[PDB]
DNA sequence: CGATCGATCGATCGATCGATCGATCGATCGATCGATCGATCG
């Protein structure tokens, strides 16, 4: 959100997936991120939108972008003999996008 | 007539394990602070 004297209302000003929009949006080790962030990344990928209400503003944007992500196992080994489900922390629910 | 032996059963030492509990180290969600600026007022 920035400040604008001309209009004096709030604008609002896109971050790292509206400007991938039409392209691809890379998230190197993507496991060691909040799941708040990591939260937004999933709903990015599902509407290809994102929705935000702060500070007044509530609107929408276009965020088409492609994803190319990076992680790592749980203790830095892959665990062969259990499900992918079951070696990172990320959840099912992510993973299925 | 009895002297030798290979098998069986009861009992015990012990080496071990499962269920349960409180205690130790740690991830992490919440509270607070701060820094620049803006809107209202004198």
Redesign the pocket.
């Known amino acids: 959100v920035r400040?604008d004297?001309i209009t004096?209302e709030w604008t609002l000003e896109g971050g790292a997936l509206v400007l991938a929009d039409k392209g691809v949006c890379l998230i190197d080790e993507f496991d060691k991120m909040?799941?708040?962030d990591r939260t937004s990344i999933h709903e990015a990928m599902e509407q290809q939108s994102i929705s935000i209400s702060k500070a007044g503003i509530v609107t929408t944007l276009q965020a088409r972008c492609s994803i190319i992500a990076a992680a790592n196992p749980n203790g830095g080994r892959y665990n062969s003999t259990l499900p992918l489900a079951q070696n990172v922390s990320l959840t099912e629910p992510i993973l299925s996008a």
Do not use: H, V, Y
């Open positions: 400040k004297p004096k909040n799941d708040q």
